[PDB]
């Protein structure tokens, strides 16, 4: 959430509650848009970037798995990688493709599934690319102890009632498997964004 | 039997001893300071050591 | 019952006697104890007599002692089957203090304490070799 993230930059001493003056003068923008809400839902891959004489940031994970800043390029800031959190499916071409922060993006790609990821720009919300969820792809584990690790998909296991586990080969250690909700694919052979050491 | 005994006899011994207030004598240094002394006294030139250790003996 | 404990108990009292064996009927979890003895060389030989036609199976033992020192100082049971008392690879209670081993039926099969511990697989103790 925004308040924690902004404060990480500021923290030398005696700001914090005075975050409010910065927000209301609109010298913080998040994804090119005004939000002054501390309770704002955030996830991995949010872009922060502020007006004019500013900087660009990507949300990353520490050892716990809490949000922290890393500097990111201005070119990369224009783009954002967004999980398709939920889907309204098919006919007449009216998907609501939910994201973690709550952005909707509309209308067919020649695919679309839940747990697949959509590459989006930032301001206009038009579809740069669509990334399929499949084996061999690069993943970040969003939750648990295992957070801040990256690895390549060994296999996905499909079962009755839910598809229980999806297995990741790599880790600092050895293989681990996680739920589909924990898995956020962040790279594919078609389009990766992954060129980052990570977390723990 | 007797459980209805006299109440008359209370406090005889103190009133048959003369009261004596404590005296002024050279004061050992106190708290932390007193504790310092103890190891030096018992281990260097010792004190007494009949049986275990002893201190305020006269006739033995 | 399950035999197991009977073999262990009989073994140590027979050592005090200084007999060269006692010979008895055997079962399948008491096939296991004898083979483990061979590995850790309490036995340098064991023979399973009449396990072919008869009503039972059996095995006369040829057993170490009648030497100088006894090799098996103590073996005493630590619960048969039909019970829940359980150890893991990390839980490890022990007898002896590493001179002996703790008899363990593991997932794959019966192996000694160190083998099971390395593989990181738990199981249920059968007895305490000192």
């Amino acid at each position: 959430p925004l308040i924690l993230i902004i404060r990480n930059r500021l923290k030398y001493a005696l700001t914090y509650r005075e975050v409010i003056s910065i927000l209301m003068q609109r010298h913080v923008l998040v994804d090119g848009k005004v939000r002054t809400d501390k309770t704002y839902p955030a996830g991995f891959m949010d872009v922060i970037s502020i007006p004019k004489t500013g900087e660009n940031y990507r949300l990353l994970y520490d050892t716990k798995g809490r949000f922290r800043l890393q500097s990111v390029k201005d070119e990369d800031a224009k783009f954002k990688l967004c999980k398709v959190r939920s889907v309204q499916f098919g006919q007449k071409g009216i998907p609501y493709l939910n994201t973690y922060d709550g952005r909707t993006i509309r209308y067919p790609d020649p695919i679309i599934k839940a747990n697949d990821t959509i590459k989006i720009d930032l301001e206009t919300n038009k579809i740069v690319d669509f990334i399929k969820f499949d084996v061999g792809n690069v993943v970040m584990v969003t939750g648990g102890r295992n957070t801040g690790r990256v690895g390549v998909i060994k296999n996905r296991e499909k079962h009755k009632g839910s598809f229980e586990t999806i297995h990741v080969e790599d880790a600092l250690g050895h293989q681990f498997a996680t739920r589909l909700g924990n898995v956020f694919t962040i790279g594919k052979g078609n389009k990766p964004w992954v060129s980052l050491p990570k977390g723990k | 039997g007797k459980v209805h005994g006299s109440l008359a006899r209370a406090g005889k011994v103190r009133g048959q001893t003369p009261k004596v207030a404590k005296q002024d004598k050279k004061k050992k240094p106190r708290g932390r300071a007193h504790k310092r002394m103890q190891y030096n006294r018992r281990f260097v030139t010792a004190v007494v050591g009949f049986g275990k250790k002893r201190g305020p003996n006269s006739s033995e | 019952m399950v035999r197991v404990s009977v073999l262990n108990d009989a073994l140590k009292t027979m050592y005090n006697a200084e007999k060269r064996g006692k010979r008895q009927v055997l079962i399948r979890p008491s096939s296991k104890v004898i083979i483990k003895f061979l590995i850790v060389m309490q036995k340098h030989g064991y023979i399973g007599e009449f396990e072919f036609v008869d009503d039972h199976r059996s095995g006369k033992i040829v057993v170490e002692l009648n030497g100088r020192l006894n090799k098996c100082g103590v073996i005493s049971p630590r619960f048969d089957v039909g019970v829940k008392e359980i150890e893991s690879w990390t839980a490890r209670l022990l007898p002896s203090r590493q001179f002996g081993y703790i008899v363990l039926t593991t997932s794959a099969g019966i192996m000694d304490h160190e083998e099971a511990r390395r593989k990181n697989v738990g199981g249920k103790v059968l007895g305490f070799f000192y």
Partner: protein
Amino acid sequence: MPRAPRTYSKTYSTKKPRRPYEKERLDAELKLVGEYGLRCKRELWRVQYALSRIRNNARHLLTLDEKNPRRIFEGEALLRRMNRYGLLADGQNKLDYVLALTVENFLARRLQTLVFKAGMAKSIHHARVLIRQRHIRVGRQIVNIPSFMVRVESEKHIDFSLTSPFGGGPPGRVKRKNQKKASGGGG
């Protein structure tokens, strides 16, 4: 959110006497207290607690199998924490000695005994006072605390503080009154 208060958890153990007065125990403890120059058995109890808990952690790693993931990773921390302080000498780094250890090693690394060892005091009782007298320090910022627990790194740095005599400028009150009387009064 708004935070909570303070727990603590035991700093010391006075649990160690089974029997409150043991002649053997009393004699042994008082000798240690005398040599290192502690004032109280309370000061003995806290260091005794520190010894026991540090040892307790070590036992767990070594009893477990070799090349167990906890044993190797945590074992790096276990070795260096003692070694850095100077609690554990090099050569004793077998991990057998970490299990063993002694009470004495902690007291030896304290600042108070270091003052006496490097001359100056002419009594361990005098060494206890000297730190309060503002003498001796690693940097500039006076230690008046005997249980400072020198790293061996900071042992080298021990020389008089910037204030107090032998360190420099001010002598303190007793001379100041004496010289004032001497130069105007004739004593």
